[PDB]
Design a protein around this ligand. Structure first.
Ligand SMILES: Nc1nc2c(ncn2[C@@H]2O[C@H](COP(=O)(O)OP(=O)(O)NP(=O)(O)O)[C@@H](O)[C@H]2O)c(=O)[nH]1
Ligand SMILES: [Cl-]
Ligand SMILES: [Mg+2]
Lengths: 127, 204, 1000, 12
């Protein structure tokens, strides 16, 4: 005998490339918050689905919040491939915080599928 | 575990835009000249623990230079920035390097040619050789397209920590919380819906 | 409370200063940001220098004394000669004394290196002002004081280093030609005594910090000192032996030896040649015995990144490449020097394996130098056969992705291709053997990977055109076979995709082979068509790029009837085009049609070419006809996003084909032209009606953006044809007038946010090609776009950036081709034209600034050519001095450096007009100057007064001397420019020497 | 004529 020399508890329901914006209401300006994979993550011990999004390369969190059933996706005047909605608790940058988000995708097709999956996930969190 | 980083280069080369991208993820299209210096903590999460850069984003315009080389005292690393669409900004790189290493004699320095996203490039790749005899790391970067935007900090983190295999890693993602002001958010939301998103022709 | 240091009526509280400083440097957040603004206001107080002597003697904070010296620096470099001579001596004395006192305290010397370096630099600023004329004993006293103390000696090496830098390395921008030459001559005159000290310290000294500082100063000296100091003093032996053994001195010594490898050397002296051989021999010996042997794994060493290893290997690469590029011939004939030659190159081989892109490019540049010499120079290549064999493997294995987003990668591929082509000519057999061998290890899995098969395929593709056609044939076949079997061998998805891409890349790089093997070429294309139905990500894009790539090179074989075929293959492609392209995205469809256009343009029979053209366009032309019927019927269709997208893709298809066919596209353009311009009008009405009903935000909506895409593609199609048209009679008599009717009024009468800058670009091409033939049309263009576009861009430099750029490209071409259109302008409009040019001067935006200066230059030449007529005489009277002073403003304001050369050219042209008496009328009023005064005297007078008020700190003598030199030199651009540069230096300080402008 | 290669190519 010779001797020899934190989303792990979650399931991925949906993954799509996207760019996320935050509305700076004081500047009446949309500001980029991050580009990367947007994930709907279903916790196996609660069945709650959250959005988790990270920036390419740095992998820093740019969105982390429950897909609340009260949220409503609305179109943006300038895009057929984006959704706008208010978020009351996002913890991507520390303390909880409210934001008006916009998320844009590579195609109107990907945008509609996102809304499909976004609504599916809302009733997962509802039930 | 924090390191002072001084960022220097001609005015308009993209120093502040580059840092802002790393701070908030945004791309600032306007040119608001920096006055003197602006200090911003910047944290990266690595397989060797978090590393903090105290970024001294200095002014490149002479009339806004403030303390100038006074900002370089006790810097442990630096980025020199020029603009591949403006030859003069590369011509001035040896002047910034001179003033920098007279104060910071032995520090890791990255040379960055910014704005490679622009088609009509003027400082060709083959002309960029100043870093060779000066032992600077060089990267083509674009704060607009994010091309190589993480390389300057990754290389400096490896030099400062003394670990050539240091990597950026995914910061842990805590469980987010669960959910009077209904007439208030429907106002901010109506304004947001009717303000067009920028760069609608981008791939994403 | 921290703002108290900003009150100079009181004595300065040093303790309060140190708190502000500490808050800035060691603090954070608002406190730090507040102290920053205070310190800046403090340092910028023009009396703050008076409080420097206090801070430097009584403060305990090094940062505070540093900021004090910064304040002194500003004063010395900008206002030194304004001071009373009492303050100059005083400042000088308490800088000299502060340095001596810091050098004598071993503790301060050891721990305040930053503050000592800043003090030395400040001392150097005084020397640039005062030495040698008012300080002839500086160098003798420095040399004497060096022996009294090792700390002072070491610091004097720092002072001499900075002095040499300021005088020889950084003077070209910062001082006048005369002052630079004065200081260079002054240092050169006393260098014999400087070198003696430096050589003694190196020969005798044992303090490591002193040796390092002395060698760091030598590095600067080697930029300029005569070669005798290096080749007649034995210092080369010291550098290449003694100082390569100690790691402390090894980095700087290598940098010194690299510079020595560039000294000015006579190429005929046999001893100098032996000395050059000898220090290379010594240096390589010290590396092999003290650092690492020739066999060492430098890739691993570099990756580990211990200590200063990476910087050392970088420096070694620079030394070896620099020396060998200049001197390797000295090693190639003498047999006793062969081992040295090949060991030096073997080190370079090992350095070339390091994973470090920028270092690889440094070694790759050398390899290019070498293999190009072996390719041309008789009897040399056999010396390097084993080096070159290893290099073939290094380059093949580090081949980077060709263009086929990253221009640094693209440049690196081309450089790698160049070296590998040379290496293949040098030994075709070894190259083929390496490549076939690498390929076997792909099939046997020992080196299989996505990266490794891509790299090898890129290498194989890069040497196309080097082998013989027969060896190429056998080579290409073997590769494709081996690549095919490699594809079968894989059961995966992406696995199967990678090998397929590489196969099509290799074949795309060997057109000569495809041209001689039609059966194979046909089969290649048909397999690309098959791939155009593959939904796997990236295959379709690969198929289309390969298709057009092959077509550009082999088009002739698609346009002739090939033996064994009943029709030219272009007909077969066209017949099945709907099926072939059914699964492609629009972008990929247009590439396909473009590729077909390349083929069709090879058919030189007009009737057959036009038939092929209309066949190719059958699908878009039918969709077009259908839409022009069902969209003129119910204009509401154009609000259907689907019809809008269809329309845009039809026009984009015409653009793609017109891009390939140019002049030959005219028949297809005529089929759609008139209805296309009607569609342009209808779409324009919708955009306008949409903006009226929704507001400016309508221009951001997908519907309106889709409508403007139609307009932009229509303009692009017209632009593309007209720029390539050969029949300009038809352009002028068929195309232009419908075009102008369709686009000009619509542009003029839309609100700013609805105007398409593409309109200006299109008009620029119209004027470029046929502007000389449509003077009335050019006038109409100006009337419709000039004032309304100018009003968009003359409120700042930022809004409407595309209009800004295209606007000045349009004025440039109009001023070139149809200058008469500007003559027809009413006087108020011609004045806006001058205002617009000067407005362009003031842009930092290079795309605008350069055209602004060129329009100015061209305009002056246009006026000059008119001769002595009333319009030119009025022009000079109204605008000559506006152009002179506006040009001077951007020359001197420090925010338009990038345009210096063209500003100088413009200014030289304007001044030469007067001193050649090419302005026929007086430039002054009948009142303001005696009758008969020459324009030359009045110009010298106007400019003297202009500069006196704009730069009041200049003496009348400076201005008068500057203008005398400038006007004398207005026929000699480079001297003219030197005199302007001298002026730019002098306006930054007080008391510039007016005799400086006599330099030339 | 390279019949062999064309057949290997068609069947990829
Ligand atoms: N196209 C492009 N534009 C960029 C890029 N980076 C910055 N810019 C733009 O360059 C302009 C100036 O940016 P800025 O960050 O203020 O430069 P700066 O070096 O900080 N200037 P200063 O030294 O005076 O403070 C901005 O308009 C910015 O949007 C880039 O990577 N690509
Ligand atoms: Cl590399
Ligand atoms: Mg800035």
């Amino acid at each position: 005998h010779f001797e020899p020399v934190m989303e792990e508890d979650e399931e991925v329901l949906y993954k799509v490339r996207a760019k996320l914006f935050r509305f700076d209401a004081d500047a009446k300006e949309w500001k980029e918050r991050g580009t990367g994979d947007c994930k709907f993550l279903k916790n196996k011990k609660t069945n709650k689905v959250r959005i988790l999004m990270r920036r390419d390369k740095t992998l820093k969190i740019c969105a982390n919040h429950i897909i609340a059933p009260e949220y409503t996706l609305k179109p943006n005047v300038g895009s057929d491939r984006s959704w706008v909605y208010a978020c009351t608790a996002d913890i991507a940058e520390g303390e909880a915080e409210a934001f008006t988000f916009a998320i844009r995708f590579g195609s109107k097709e990907n945008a509609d599928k996102f809304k499909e999956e976004f609504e599916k996930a809302q009733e997962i969190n509802k039930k | 575990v924090q390191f002072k980083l001084v960022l220097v280069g001609d005015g308009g080369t993209g120093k502040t835009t580059f840092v802002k991208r790393h701070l908030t993820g945004e791309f600032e299209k306007k040119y608001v000249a920096t006055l003197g210096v602006e200090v911003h903590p910047l944290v990266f999460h690595t397989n060797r623990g978090p590393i903090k850069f105290n970024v001294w984003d200095t002014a490149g315009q002479e009339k806004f230079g403030g303390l100038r080389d006074g900002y370089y005292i006790q810097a442990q690393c630096a980025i020199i920035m020029f603009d591949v669409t403006s030859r003069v900004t590369y011509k001035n790189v040896p002047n910034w390097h001179r003033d920098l290493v007279r104060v910071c004699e032995n520090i890791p320095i990255v040379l960055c040619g910014n704005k490679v996203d622009i088609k009509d490039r003027k400082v060709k790749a083959k002309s960029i050789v100043f870093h060779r005899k000066k032992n600077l790391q060089y990267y083509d970067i674009s704060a607009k397209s994010n091309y190589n935007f993480e390389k300057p900090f990754l290389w400096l983190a490896r030099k400062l920590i003394g670990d050539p295999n240091l990597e950026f890693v995914a910061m842990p993602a805590l469980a987010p919380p669960e959910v009077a002001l209904a007439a208030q958010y429907e106002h901010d939301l109506e304004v947001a819906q009717t303000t067009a998103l920028p760069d609608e022709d981008d791939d994403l | 409370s921290m703002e108290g240091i900003l009150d100079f009526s009181n004595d300065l509280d040093i303790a309060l200063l140190d708190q502000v400083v500490s808050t800035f440097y060691q603090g954070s957040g608002v406190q730090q940001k507040q102290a920053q603004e205070i310190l800046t206001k403090f340092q910028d107080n023009p009396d703050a220098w008076q409080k420097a002597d206090q801070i430097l003697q009584f403060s305990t904070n090094p940062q505070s004394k540093f900021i004090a010296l910064s304040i002194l620096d500003k004063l010395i470099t900008r206002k030194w000669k304004l001071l009373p001579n009492d303050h100059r001596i005083g400042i000088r004395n308490f800088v000299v004394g502060m340095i001596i006192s810091m050098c004598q305290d071993d503790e301060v010397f050891k721990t305040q290196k930053n503050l000592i370096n800043k003090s030395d630099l400040t001392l150097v600023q005084i020397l640039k002002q005062e030495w040698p004329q008012n300080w002839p004993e500086f160098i003798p006293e420095l040399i004497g004081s060096s022996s009294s103390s090792v700390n002072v000696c070491e610091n004097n090496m720092i002072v001499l280093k900075l002095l040499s830098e300021e005088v020889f390395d950084f003077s070209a921008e910062q001082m006048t030609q005369a002052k630079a030459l004065h200081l260079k001559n002054s240092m050169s005159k006393e260098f014999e005594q400087i070198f003696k000290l430096c050589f003694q310290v190196l020969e005798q000294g044992s303090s490591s910090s002193l040796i390092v500082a002395t060698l760091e100063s030598l590095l600067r000296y080697l930029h300029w000192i005569p070669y005798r100091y290096i080749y007649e003093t034995n210092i080369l032996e010291l550098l290449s032996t003694k100082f390569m053994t100690s790691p402390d001195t090894r980095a700087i010594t290598l940098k010194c030896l690299t510079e020595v490898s560039n000294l000015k050397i006579p190429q005929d002296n046999d001893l100098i040649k032996r000395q050059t051989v000898l220090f290379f021999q010594n240096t390589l010996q010290q590396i092999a015995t003290s650092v690492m042997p020739v066999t060492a794994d430098l890739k691993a060493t570099y990756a580990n990144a211990n200590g200063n290893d990476q910087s050392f290997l970088q420096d070694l690469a620079m030394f070896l490449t620099t020396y060998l590029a200049r001197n390797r011939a000295l090693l190639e004939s003498d047999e006793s020097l062969r081992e040295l030659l090949l060991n030096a190159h073997q080190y370079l081989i090992q350095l070339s394996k390091i994973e470090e892109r920028e270092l690889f490019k440094t070694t790759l540049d050398y390899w290019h130098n070498l293999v190009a010499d072996l390719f041309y120079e008789p009897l040399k290549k056999h010396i390097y056969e084993e080096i070159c064999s290893q290099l073939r493997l290094v380059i093949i294995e580090n081949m980077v992705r060709p263009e086929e987003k990253e221009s640094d990668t693209i440049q690196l591929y081309k450089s790698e291709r160049e070296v590998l082509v040379y290496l293949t000519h040098l030994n075709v057999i070894d190259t083929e053997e390496i490549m076939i061998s690498k390929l076997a290890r792909q099939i046997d899995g020992s080196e299989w990977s996505w990266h490794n098969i891509n790299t090898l395929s890129w290498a194989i593709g890069s040497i196309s055109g080097t082998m013989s056609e027969d060896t190429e044939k056998r080579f290409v076949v073997t590769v494709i076979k081996d690549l095919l079997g490699l594809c079968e061998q894989k059961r995966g998805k992406d696995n199967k995709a990678v090998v397929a891409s590489d196969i099509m890349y290799v074949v795309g790089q060997y057109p000569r082979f495809l041209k001689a093997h039609w059966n194979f070429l046909r089969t290649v294309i048909l397999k690309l068509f098959e791939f155009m139905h593959e939904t796997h990500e990236g295959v379709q894009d690969m198929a289309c790029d390969t298709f057009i790539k092959i077509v550009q090179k082999c088009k002739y074989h698609f346009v002739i009837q090939q033996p064994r075929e009943s029709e030219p293959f272009i007909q077969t492609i066209i017949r099945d085009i709907q099926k072939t392209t059914a699964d492609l995205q629009p972008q990929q469809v247009h590439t396909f049609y473009k590729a077909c256009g390349i083929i069709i343009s090879e058919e030189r029979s007009v009737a057959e070419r036009n038939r092929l053209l209309s066949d190719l366009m059958q699908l878009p032309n039918m969709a077009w006809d259908t839409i022009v019927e069902q969209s003129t019927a119910n204009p509401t269709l154009l609000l259907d996003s689907e019809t809008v997208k269809i329309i845009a893709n039809i026009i984009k298809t015409n653009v793609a084909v017109c891009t390939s066919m140019g002049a030959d596209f005219y028949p297809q353009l005529g089929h759609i032209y008139y209805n296309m311009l009607q569609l342009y009008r209808a779409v324009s009405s919708m955009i306008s009606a949409q903006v009226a009903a929704e507001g400016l935000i309508a221009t951001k909506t997908p519907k309106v953006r889709g409508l403007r895409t139609i307009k932009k593609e229509i303009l692009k199609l017209v632009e593309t044809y007209i720029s390539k048209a050969r029949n300009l009679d038809d352009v002028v008599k068929v195309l232009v007038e419908p075009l102008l009717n369709a686009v000009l009024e619509d542009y003029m009468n839309n609100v700013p946010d609805a105007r398409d800058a593409e309109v200006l670009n299109c008009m620029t091409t119209v004027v470029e090609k046929v502007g000389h033939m449509i003077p009335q049309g050019v006038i109409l263009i100006l009337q419709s776009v000039f004032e309304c576009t100018l009003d968009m861009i003359n409120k700042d430099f930022t809004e409407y950036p595309e209009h800004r750029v295209e606007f000045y490209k349009l004025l440039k071409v109009i001023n070139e081709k149809s200058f008469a259109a500007f003559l027809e302008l009413p006087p108020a409009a011609f004045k806006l034209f001058v205002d617009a040019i000067c407005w362009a001067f003031k842009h930092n935006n290079r795309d605008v600034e350069v055209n602004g200066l060129q329009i100015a230059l061209d305009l002056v030449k246009n006026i000059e050519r008119m001769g002595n007529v009333p319009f030119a005489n009025e022009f000079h009277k109204n605008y000559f001095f506006i152009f002179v002073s506006e040009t001077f403003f951007v020359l001197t304001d420090s925010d338009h450096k990038s345009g210096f050369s063209k500003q100088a050219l413009l200014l030289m042209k304007l001044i030469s007009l007067v001193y050649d008496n090419k302005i026929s009328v007086p430039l002054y009023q009948e009142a303001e100057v005696p009758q008969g005064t020459s324009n030359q005297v009045y110009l010298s007078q106007y400019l003297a007064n202009m500069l006196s008020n704009a730069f009041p700190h200049l003496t009348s003598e400076q201005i008068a001397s500057f203008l005398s030199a400038l006007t004398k030199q207005c026929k000699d651009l480079v001297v003219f420019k030197g005199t302007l540069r001298d002026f730019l230096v002098q306006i930054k300080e007080v008391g510039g020497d007016p005799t400086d402008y006599l330099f030339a | 004529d390279l019949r062999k290669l064309c057949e290997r190519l068609r069947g990829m």
